[PDB]
Structure 1
Amino acid sequence: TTFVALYDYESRTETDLSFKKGDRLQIVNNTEGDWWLAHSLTTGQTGYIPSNYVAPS
């Protein structure tokens, strides 16, 4: 299964991928799962987490 970029995206960090509209991309299986933007009720910090690391309460 192959995706196609609908928009350009410029990498903002050392871990994201830049692409131009029309580029073809393949998703890569990773242990961590999809990454979610999350807010910590425990610490008040906010940022991306690996979804396979968490569970519904």
Structure 2
Amino acid sequence: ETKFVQALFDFNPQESGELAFKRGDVITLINKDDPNWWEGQLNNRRGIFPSNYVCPYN
């Protein structure tokens, strides 16, 4: 089952390789192995983000 998560708050990337998203955005999970930095896809973009900025959606 393809897992998703929804953005709780906006997240403006500080370093390269980080996924930018607005609150309410639904992100697709690629990697959830590291408890802090998860990797996902948002349309065209792909990158890591703070897990404490999202919660499950689907």
Higher relative contact order (CA 8 A, sep 6+): 2
Indicate the structure with greater strand content.
2
Question: TM-score, with normalisation over the residues of structure 1?
Answer: 0.49
Structure index of larger Rg:
1
